[PDB]
Design a protein around this ligand. Structure first.
Ligand SMILES: *[C@@H]1O[C@H](CO)[C@@H](O[C@@H]2O[C@H](CO)[C@@H](O[C@@H]3O[C@H](CO[C@H]4O[C@H](CO)[C@@H](O)[C@H](O)[C@@H]4O)[C@@H](O)[C@H](O[C@H]4O[C@H](CO)[C@@H](O)[C@H](O)[C@@H]4O)[C@@H]3O)[C@H](O)[C@H]2NC(C)=O)[C@H](O)[C@H]1NC(C)=O
Ligand SMILES: *[C@@H]1O[C@H](CO)[C@@H](O[C@@H]2O[C@H](CO)[C@@H](O[C@@H]3O[C@H](CO[C@H]4O[C@H](CO)[C@@H](O)[C@H](O)[C@@H]4O)[C@@H](O)[C@H](O[C@H]4O[C@H](CO)[C@@H](O)[C@H](O)[C@@H]4O)[C@@H]3O)[C@H](O)[C@H]2NC(C)=O)[C@H](O)[C@H]1NC(C)=O
Ligand SMILES: *[C@@H]1O[C@H](CO)[C@@H](O[C@@H]2O[C@H](CO)[C@@H](O[C@@H]3O[C@H](CO)[C@@H](O)[C@H](O[C@H]4O[C@H](CO)[C@@H](O)[C@H](O)[C@@H]4O)[C@@H]3O)[C@H](O)[C@H]2NC(C)=O)[C@H](O)[C@H]1NC(C)=O
Ligand SMILES: *[C@@H]1O[C@H](CO)[C@@H](O[C@@H]2O[C@H](CO)[C@@H](O[C@@H]3O[C@H](CO)[C@@H](O)[C@H](O[C@H]4O[C@H](CO)[C@@H](O)[C@H](O)[C@@H]4O)[C@@H]3O)[C@H](O)[C@H]2NC(C)=O)[C@H](O)[C@H]1NC(C)=O
Ligand SMILES: *[C@@H]1O[C@H](CO)[C@@H](O)[C@H](O)[C@H]1NC(C)=O
Ligand SMILES: *[C@@H]1O[C@H](CO)[C@@H](O)[C@H](O)[C@H]1NC(C)=O
Ligand SMILES: *[C@@H]1O[C@H](CO)[C@@H](O)[C@H](O)[C@H]1NC(C)=O
Ligand SMILES: *[C@@H]1O[C@H](CO)[C@@H](O)[C@H](O)[C@H]1NC(C)=O
Lengths: 213, 563, 213, 563
């Protein structure tokens, strides 16, 4: 039978006002024989009727993929309301219900620290600008890069990890390729900036600078 | 603005008349105490002198000469101390001031002095020659104004006139007035006092002024003075400010005094004004006393424990104290000087003889090491060969503790220059800038002169240079990379604020990190060379610093290198 | 019904000779009513009969947990042999078979780089010594710390992450607590050393040093 | 070992006899060329002198005096150049050498010279006085050995004896032998040559030696010489080594010569031996020529472009060239000297008068700035007050370019010292160390003397100090933290290699990072203070460096601080 998977809104959307967050309910392995899927959304137990549904997206293994999108409010998600997706199909003996929400626990503020590459990394074909994010909670967090105010998009962030104390930590790795424009900006000492967006941050935002020597 | 400097151009034809008027305006605007000389000269009939109204004290002398204007509003002037004296004799000098040649109506020349408040002239005398149309200059009885001391100071008053004068106002004492009106009645504060009183507000004993008062007073106390005979210590008139230290009695170890103060002119002050020097003897001055050495901490003078390190003396100082200009006889004296304790003047005789030899354009390169001029810079002549003043391209500060004609720290007149070369200049510590009659000189309004000044009375006076319009035509402008469009000249070297990066003197947009012919590294927006034994790196930085221990790779030594 | 989960040997065991690696086959949700579980192990399709089995480990939710341990050879695992665990129980309509093996692909050598803490991290209650491990393959890797030759064990390592190129990268974070003995060694400049053990490394080992300024 | 230094103790009673024997052993062991003087003195009968066997050349003079030993194995000795001369006259001096007082059997004294190879004495004469038992010293005909030049050089041979001598061997020419055996037949290489030949291997013209040969030859060429009259340039005997430069002909610009070489004694060499100085004139020397200045590059001499910077001259140099010791008359001359170009001697008269005044223990503190002594250090007297030599506690190098008595760079005898204070000493550039008869001196075997030497011939000669056993009792040992157990004294200051960390002079196990009273930071195993305006941090480091921009937090400035 099919299988359901429910994703939260992007943390950047949650915190920025003019960005619309949305809880997304995916349905995979929808049979060729029984494609009719039906969704019911619930907030703290109350149906919505607001969400919309993307069309059938056929996949490689001859199955459909139906995706229901429920656009949510910033206050409701941040205040811990449960978003519940009830999928129903003929191939399912019983309907599938999945509930997502804000992580429930003590909120804690991140500490952002930028580390420069080690001298040895410069011989390789790329140098890595590291941005440590430490002691935060919950794991929902958005991390970007930018130099001279312009976003950079060669960065790879790890999944949050549980520290011995309970708070979360992660690293981000902005790859600066050899011969790259982002490299010339780095060697000229231009300002590279690691932006962070998290709930407990005052104004839901802090960013740390970083430059050469 | 309470305090302004005076001038020392005594009776010399000002270069440009427009600037002379504006110069006096900028200088005495709102000024109440003239630390120096009040010199009003060559002023035309249609001239406004309202800025002079608030002048109360003049430390030096007062010279009013060669003016077509009809009166000078110096009613609030109470005292003239006369530390300097005109022609080494007079505190007050009123000379000429009359129409010499050819309508409308009215005549030219001064009319009435109207020095209503002037009741004190400590050191000095009076000189009034010619001045047709000058009235009531013989009705004064100056020996009331002259202090008890230096009374013998001369009086020499010409009473030639080209017109007759009315009697004084009937409200005044007979033959006692500065003008035909009642408000011009002469106030008398000496020779009409009780007993041996030098100053008083009346003939009674109770009217006598305190010992320390000058000119007059509002009461018997030292707080009631009109002007302090010596020093103004926080409203009180005293003989000397409190010393900075008091000595032990049994020993004589010096102990710092909280009540100590510094002497600034005739005023006790908690600290010396900007650009002035603080001394151990408790005085603000523009040159250190002899045996002392200038050093910062906050500029200050300290007496030399070891031999006073040798310094460079410019014009107006030491062996050059009486030298007019830089010539072949003294040009070598500035070999490799970073800082010159004096002034620098370049006159047509600099580049001509005086059986001395004329100066040559290459000799001037000596000043390329010069970073600071304490005194002033004056250039009335400069070789047609040279296009600019890049000889002075490393000069950062012209402090102006001395000023040409008492007014201009920087002067540039009558030159075949085409732009200013002073790319390192950041401060005109004092005095005005005068740049006029440089037929080919562009790049003036390109300089952010506002940045260079440090007090209100400073300003740039420019006229008769090449028109800004004419400069735009021909395609002259700051190089692409000059931030805020401020530059001293054309090329990239002449930028004020470099937009991108500095390769020595050039302002360039790309250092040679990543694959430059000689690899480089950045450091505070400066390009600098990687150590030669560092190995050139293709698409990655070559070094973090200047040394051989900061390479990415070597040419051939645990951190260092050794090709 | 029950659920099976098969774990590989520790990467440190695989590479060190005098350490015995072992493939471990866990069985959870073994019913109170049907505890009899039976294991069959296979290497490249061939039964073994060598593995041993730990006893029933009862859990909080009133289920047993049976664990079968098959000690493996270093050559066999490194040469990519498939280790297959066939669990059989009454509650399972059909037996469960799970196959583990070495990750199959191009092997690549790690690059190890030690980064010191940022100046700002020193105000906090602990400073983090970071050890970047970059551009390696496969993900099996073991990372330790040690100062003056003595292991340190306050470190937290992220899961390997896929780089844009295909190789893996991760970070490790040795926590040096305020007032800690490991802190005094750090401030005195003693040698901290990030040890790495990976297949493609020559001698299956490389370690990078790190000290203050 | 081919080359060793000689000595300059001419005829002075050696301090300790055991060390004198060992000293000669260490010195001439395997030595073939004595750059200096071969001085064999005060040697007893039961003494072995086998190390002398390989000596071929002596640059200076040869002095054999006051020896009970019966012969000296100098058969290979071919030439004595005699640059120095004993009593300013003699290259060869054989004096005394005989039993003076009271069995076993045999008598005491030298017997036969046996200088079989000695066929050249360039500059100098011969002196043989007393030496009862000396035979065949009148059978030599020295004017064959004396070179053509300085032939007049004196000969003064006493033939007193206490025994008779056999005839020479019948194989020798009549009255031509260095001893009664056949192997002692006198070889004759002058006055038996063809024509004006100074040296030859026979009477024939073809037997004559080349112009540059000395003593003799194996053929006519300059490669067949037995010893080079002037310089040995790669097997060839020449008059002067190739200059380092050759001059232009039309100009006179100097061009570097690849064939250039330096003069080292009588040898052309590609580079100067260690501890010697290289000069521009192409010579290895132990003192720079006048007008030159010592500087490294590799120590070397350069002529002074500007005034030769003033340096400190010790004993044996300049105005102190003929001064015996440090006294009250010269102690002040070393005020704040880092490096002394000379020697330092402290004799009992240093601390006594000479109507000069005696020296005092506090005056010696002057040397606490001294880091390097070019010459030598000799201390035969030192105040009982002081326990050690920590006055010299910052002395790093005693180069030994000069040596006491030509042998000892460091000497310490007859002192009430209890330990050596020289915690900074790392190098004895040359010469031996002699430390003996210091009744209370411990901490000798605690010093890793092996580290301090730089050539094979160096060694420590110690005797009659306080026994190592007696020092262990009483509980004296290196402090806990002295690495490898090497220390110059008791406390933690006196460690050689600090196990943990260095707080100035103390070797301590804990710097004050993390909560020290004045916070600190480490830097190459040194504790250093954090800037005061840094804020003390509880359980975390306080700063990365010395400056105020390296703080963790401040006391009160974008990177800096300003309490
Ligand atoms: C037939 O074809 C379809 C279409 O590809 C396959 O569907 C995949 O099924 C797997 C099942 O394992 C899905 O895997 C899940 O991925 C989740 C996140 O990845 C998605 O979301 C991000 C964010 O939007 C996307 O960027 C990304 O591309 C993916 O679309 C994980 O979170 C899931 O993990 C959770 O479930 C496991 C299992 O219970 C728990 O143990 C975990 O703790 C965790 O809670 C899960 O791994 C995959 O997403 C599906 N594809 C797509 C495109 O969605 C079918 O698998 C294939 N055939 C078969 C037989 O399934
Ligand atoms: C009744 O009580 C039992 C006992 O606790 C529970 O059993 C747990 O069941 C969960 C099922 O999700 C198991 O979760 C799995 O954990 C694996 C790794 O964790 C174990 O291994 C390490 C290393 O030895 C141990 O240190 C650690 O403590 C754990 O023991 C994951 O790798 C698994 O993920 C894989 O499966 C998912 C799901 O298909 C895939 O999508 C992933 O891609 C991945 O391949 C999995 O998450 C858990 O391990 C079990 N406990 C124990 C102790 O083993 C029961 O869950 C509980 N009740 C119920 C209703 O289950
Ligand atoms: C010797 O020095 C003393 C002072 O050191 C001087 O006496 C008086 O000093 C006071 C201040 O110390 C002066 O008062 C000021 O005058 C200026 C005008 O020049 C005003 O701008 C000041 O502020 C006024 O205006 C503000 C805005 O409305 C108000 O908020 C404020 O309350 C003030 O009213 C202030 O008034 C004063 O001018 C001098 N002089 C006199 C006569 O009072 C003395 O004159 C010096 N010379 C001597 C003793 O010979
Ligand atoms: C002037 O200087 C020259 C040399 O600059 C000198 O001539 C001969 O020089 C050679 C080397 O240049 C000497 O040969 C060596 O002698 C020593 C012994 O002192 C040996 O140890 C050397 O090595 C030998 O032994 C090795 C181990 O078995 C062998 O592997 C090796 O092949 C050698 O056999 C080497 O032999 C030589 O001793 C000198 N002297 C002579 C007479 O040859 C010359 O003597 C100097 N003085 C003058 C010209 O007056
Ligand atoms: C007027 O001036 C002339 C010259 O300046 C002088 O000689 C004459 O005495 C003056 N007249 C009077 C009345 O003083
Ligand atoms: C630098 O990289 C470029 C890449 O196009 C390559 O062509 C060139 O050969 C490289 N130069 C060196 C010196 O490696
Ligand atoms: C022996 O020596 C004495 C003094 O040394 C001397 O006078 C005497 O001439 C010597 N005898 C001979 C035979 O030379
Ligand atoms: C430092 O930490 C200890 C922890 O026991 C605490 O007691 C002390 O008050 C702290 N000191 C300061 C100055 O914070």
């Amino acid at each position: 039978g099919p299988s359901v998977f429910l994703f939260p809104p992007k943390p950047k959307d949650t915190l920025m006002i003019s960005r619309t967050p949305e809880v997304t309910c995916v349905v995979v392995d929808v049979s060729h024989e029984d494609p009719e899927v039906k969704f019911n959304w619930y907030v703290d137990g109350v149906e919505v009727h607001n969400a919309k549904t993307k069309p059938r997206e056929e996949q490689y293994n001859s199955t459909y993929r139906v995706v229901s999108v429920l656009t949510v409010l910033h206050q409701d998600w941040l205040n811990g309301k449960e978003y519940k997706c009830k999928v129903s199909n003929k191939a399912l003996p019983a309907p599938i219900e999945k509930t997502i929400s804000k992580a429930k626990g003590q909120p804690r503020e991140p500490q952002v620290y930028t580390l420069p590459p080690s001298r040895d990394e410069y011989l390789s074909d790329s140098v890595s600008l590291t941005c440590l994010v430490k002691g935060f909670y919950p794991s929902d967090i958005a991390v970007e890069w930018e130099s001279n105010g312009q976003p950079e998009n060669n960065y790879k962030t790890t999944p949050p990890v549980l520290d011995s104390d309970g708070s979360f930590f992660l690293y981000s790795k902005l790859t600066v390729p050899r011969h790259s424009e982002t490299m010339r900006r780095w060697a000229h000492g231009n300002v590279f900036s690691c932006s962070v967006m998290h709930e407990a941050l005052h104004n839901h935002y802090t960013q740390k600078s970083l430059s050469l020597s | 603005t309470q305090v302004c400097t005076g001038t020392d151009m005594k009776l010399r034809l000002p270069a440009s008349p427009e600037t002379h008027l504006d110069m006096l305006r900028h200088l005495y605007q709102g000024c109440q105490v003239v630390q120096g000389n009040l010199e009003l000269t060559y002023l035309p009939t249609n001239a406004s002198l309202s800025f002079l109204q608030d002048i109360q004290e003049v430390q030096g002398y007062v010279l009013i000469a060669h003016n077509q204007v009809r009166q000078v509003p110096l009613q609030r002037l109470r005292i003239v101390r006369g530390t300097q004296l005109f022609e080494d004799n007079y505190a007050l000098a009123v000379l000429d001031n009359g129409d010499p040649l050819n309508t409308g109506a009215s005549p030219g020349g001064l009319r009435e002095l109207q020095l209503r408040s002037l009741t004190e002239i400590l050191k000095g005398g009076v000189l009034i020659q010619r001045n047709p149309q000058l009235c009531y200059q013989d009705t004064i009885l100056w020996k009331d104004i002259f202090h008890k001391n230096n009374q013998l100071a001369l009086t020499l008053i010409d009473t030639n006139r080209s017109r007759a004068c009315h009697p004084c106002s009937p409200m005044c004492k007979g033959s006692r007035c500065w003008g035909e009106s009642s408000e011009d009645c002469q106030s008398l504060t000496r020779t009409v006092c009780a007993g041996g009183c030098a100053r008083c507000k009346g003939p009674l004993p109770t009217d006598c002024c305190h010992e320390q008062c000058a000119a007059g007073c509002t009461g018997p106390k030292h707080s009631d003075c009109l002007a302090c005979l010596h020093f103004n210590h926080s409203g009180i008139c005293e003989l000397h400010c409190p010393a900075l230290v008091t000595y032990n009695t049994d020993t004589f170890e010096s102990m710092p005094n909280p009540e100590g103060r510094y002497t600034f002119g005739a005023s006790c002050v908690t600290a010396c004004p900007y650009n002035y020097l603080s001394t151990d003897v408790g005085s603000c001055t523009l040159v250190c006393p002899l045996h002392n050495q200038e050093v910062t901490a906050t500029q200050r003078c300290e007496k030399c424990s070891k031999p006073c390190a040798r310094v460079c003396y410019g014009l107006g100082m030491e062996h050059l104290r009486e030298v007019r200009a830089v010539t072949s006889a003294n040009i070598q004296e500035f070999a490799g000087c970073k800082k010159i304790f004096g002034s620098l003047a370049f006159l047509p005789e600099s580049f001509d003889g005086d059986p001395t030899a004329p100066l040559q354009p290459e000799q001037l390169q000596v000043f390329e090491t010069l970073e600071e001029i304490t005194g002033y810079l004056y250039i009335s002549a400069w070789p047609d060969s040279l296009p600019d003043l890049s000889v002075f391209q490393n000069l950062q500060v012209i402090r102006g503790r001395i000023l040409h004609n008492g007014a201009y720290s920087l002067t540039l007149q009558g030159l075949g220059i085409s732009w200013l070369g002073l790319r390192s200049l950041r401060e005109l510590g004092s005095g005005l800038a005068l740049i006029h009659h440089n037929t080919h000189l562009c790049f003036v309004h390109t300089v952010p002169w506002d940045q260079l000044f440090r007090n209100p009375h400073q300003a740039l006076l420019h006229t008769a240079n090449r028109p800004e319009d004419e400069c735009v035509g021909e395609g002259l402008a700051c190089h692409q990379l000059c931030a805020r469009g401020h530059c001293w000249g054309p090329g990239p070297t002449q930028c004020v604020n470099c937009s991108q990066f500095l390769r020595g003197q050039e302002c360039v947009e790309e250092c040679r990190v990543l694959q430059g012919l000689p690899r480089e590294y950045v450091n505070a927006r400066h390009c600098l060379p990687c150590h030669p034994e560092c190995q050139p790196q293709n698409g990655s930085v070559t070094c973090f610093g200047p040394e051989a221990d900061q390479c990415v790779a070597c040419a051939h030594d645990p951190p260092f290198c050794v090709a």
